[PDB]
Hints:
The structure is a homodimer.
Chain A: E1 11-19, E2 24-31, E3 41-49, H1 54-61, E4 66-73, E5 76-82, E6 90-95, H2 100-106, E7 111-116, H3 118-125, H4 129-132, H5 137-143, E8 154-156, E9 163-167, E10 180-185, H6 201-219, E11 226-231, E12 240-245, E13 258-260, H7 261-270, H8 274-277, E14 280-285, H9 289-296
Helix pairs in contact in A: 6-7
The structure holds 7-methyl-guanosine-5'-triphosphate-5'-guanosine (GTG) (2 copies) and yttrium (III) ion (3 copies).
Amino acid sequence: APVRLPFSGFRLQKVLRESARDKIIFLHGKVNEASGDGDGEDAVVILEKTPFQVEQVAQLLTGSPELQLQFSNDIYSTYHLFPPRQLNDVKTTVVYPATEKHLQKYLRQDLRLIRETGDDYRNITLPHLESQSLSIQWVYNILDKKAEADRIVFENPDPSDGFVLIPDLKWNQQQLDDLYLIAICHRRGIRSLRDLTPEHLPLLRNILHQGQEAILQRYRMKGDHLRVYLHYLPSYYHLNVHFTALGFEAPGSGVERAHLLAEVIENLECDPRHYQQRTLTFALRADDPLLKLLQEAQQS
Amino acid sequence: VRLPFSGFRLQKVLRESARDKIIFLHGKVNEASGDGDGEDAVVILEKTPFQVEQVAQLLTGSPELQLQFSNDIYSTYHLFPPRQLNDVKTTVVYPATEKHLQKYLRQDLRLIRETGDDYRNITLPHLESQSLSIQWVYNILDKKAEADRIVFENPDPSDGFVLIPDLKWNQQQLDDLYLIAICHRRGIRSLRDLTPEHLPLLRNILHQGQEAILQRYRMKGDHLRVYLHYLPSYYHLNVHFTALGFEAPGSGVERAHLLAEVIENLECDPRHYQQRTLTFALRADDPLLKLLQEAQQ
Lengths: 300, 297
Ligand SMILES: C[n+]1cn([C@@H]2O[C@H](COP(=O)(O)OP(=O)(O)OP(=O)(O)OC[C@H]3O[C@@H](n4cnc5c(=O)[nH]c(N)nc54)[C@H](O)[C@@H]3O)[C@@H](O)[C@H]2O)c2nc(N)[nH]c(=O)c21
Ligand SMILES: C[n+]1cn([C@@H]2O[C@H](COP(=O)(O)OP(=O)(O)OP(=O)(O)OC[C@H]3O[C@@H](n4cnc5c(=O)[nH]c(N)nc54)[C@H](O)[C@@H]3O)[C@@H](O)[C@H]2O)c2nc(N)[nH]c(=O)c21
Ligand SMILES: [Y+3]
Ligand SMILES: [Y+3]
Ligand SMILES: [Y+3]
C-alpha cells in the first residue's frame, strides 16, 4: 500500500547539491509550517534516478515506445523515450528532521585535502569530534533490533567480535549491479579507523570473511566481485564497513576517503599502532573550521 | 516518433554503469519482420538529470510513494513520477557494424590480491613476455612528440620528469584538470619497482609538480589528488594529478595509490612494495587473471 512523506508540505529552500553524472539532486525544504509556531522544520529530500533493469528495457524496445526524435543522421539517432511506470522508479531518501550538520554535509562541496598526522588527530581532530559527527541512533536501532530487523542479511551476535550486515540506505535493492551493504560492529565505542588496534583483528576478520560469505550465499556474488572498505573520515563515528559491487563505481570509493578492509587488517598485522601513528589523508569542505584548525597546527 | 526498426531481441549487454545510470545494448532487430533475418542494432539508454522546478512542484503535491524502509530520522522510498520527469535519452545505432559492437563492449572486472611472491613468480614473468608499447613515453621524454604541450620539466635523468596534460583533458576548464608526470629514468615499471633510492625522484614529482600547477593554473596543491595506478596501463612510472573535485575514472581505492603515502611507506618500510600484497582489478578476459587465480588455488 502507498505511503506519504513523513511531513506535510515541502517548500524548497535550497538545492544543496545536484549532479548530472549520477542524476541525483539533494533538496533542503521547510516542512510542517502550518503547525505550532509556524516556522516549520527542516527536511532533506534526495532523489536519484535508478539503474536500468535490462530485461524490462529489452521488453520495452520490442514494442512501440512513446518517443520524440531529437537527432537523426544516417545510422545514428537520439530520442527522448517516455517509459511505462515500472521503468520510472526514482529512489527517494528523506532525512527529517534534518539538523544543521546534515545541511552542511550535503551542501555544494568546495573541498580541500588535508594530511592528518597522528598528533593532529590526538590534539586537534579528536577534541573537535562532536562537530564532525552525526547521531548514530540509527546504528543502535539496528543493533538493538528496533529498526531494519527484517532486513538483516547476516548477523554474528558476538558482543565483541560480532556485527550486523544489512542493505545500505543508498541501495534500492532492485538489482545486483549497484549491490551495496553496510556492516556495523556490535561493539560500541570504535569511532573510526583511528581506534583500531590488534585487539580488533578478530572483529575485522569476521566482518570481511563472514560478510563476503553471507553475500555469496544470499546474492551468489563472489568475493572477487566486491570492493570492501571503510571511510576516513566517516560521517557516523561507529565503525562501519561498506561492501560494494566492484562493477559499480560507488560514490565515496575514491582513494582520498576509502580504505580496503583486507589492507587495514594486514596493516594491523604488520604494524600494531599503524592507525594511531601514521598520517591519514582526507578531504574537508573549504569553510570547515576543522580544516582551519588543522592547517593552523601545520605551521604554528 | 518510431524506432528505425521493429522488434528487439537482446543479445548482449555491451556495457553498463549503475553509477551513471546508462546501459549499452546489442540487439537483433527485424527478426519477426521482412525475412526472419535479424539485423544488428546498438541502443544506449541513459537516465536524465532532475530539473529543480519539476521536483519542487512534485514534492509540494505530496506524491506517489512505496516505502523501502525507515530508521529514526531516515527513510527511503520508490517514487513513480509523472511523465515529465521520466525522460530517457535513447541513442540508436542501426544497422550496427561489428566495429560498433567492439567500440562499446566492456569486460566485467575481478579483484585479485597479488602477494609479493605472486608478483615475482607470476606477474613479472608475464609482463616480460609482452606489454603495451611505451614508445609514446620515450618520444615525449626526448621531445620528438608533444614538446609544444609540456607544462613543466625537470631534466635530471635520474630524479627528473616531464609534466604534460593527459590526452583526455580538453584543457578548457580547471574542473576536470588532469595532468601526468613521466619520470626520465628508464625501467621503473610501476609501484612494484619502488625503493628508498627512488625517494628523491618521487618527492620531486610531488613537490615540483604541484609548484608547476600552481604557477601555471593558479591551483593550489590542496586542490590536487596525486597518485599512481596499480596496475598501470603503461609500464613506465607515471603519476596522475587531478582536480580533487573531479571524481576521475581510475581514482578508486582498487586502483589509486596516493604519492605522498607511497613516499611515507618507503620512509617507514623500505621494502614495502616488494613484500606487501597489493589489490587491483583485472578484466575477466585478461590472461594474467587466470594465471594469478591458478597460482592462488
Ligand atoms: C542513516 N544511515 C546511513 N546508512 C549508510 O551507512 C553508511 C555510513 O557511512 P559513513 O559514516 O562511512 O559515511 P557516509 O558519509 O555516510 O557515506 P555515504 O553517505 O555513503 O557517502 C559517500 C557519498 O555518497 C554520496 N551520496 C549520499 N547518498 C547518495 C545516494 O543516495 N546516491 C548517490 N549516487 N550518492 C549518494 C555522498 O554525497 C558521499 O559523497 C553509508 O553507506 C549510508 O548510506 C544507513 N544504512 C542503513 N541500512 N540504515 C540507515 O538508517 C543508514
Ligand atoms: C598513449 N597515451 C596514454 N596517455 C595517458 O597516460 C596515462 C597512462 O596511465 P596508466 O599507465 O596508469 O594507465 P591508464 O590510466 O589505464 O591509461 P589509459 O590510456 O586509459 O589506458 C587504457 C586504455 O586501454 C583501453 N581499455 C580500457 N579498458 C578496456 C577494456 O575493458 N577493453 C578494451 N578492449 N580496452 C580497454 C582504453 O580505451 C584506454 O585507451 C593515462 O592518463 C593516459 O590517458 C597519454 N598521455 C599523453 N600525454 N600522450 C599519450 O600519447 C598518451
Ligand atoms: Y521556534
Ligand atoms: Y517565527
Ligand atoms: Y530475469
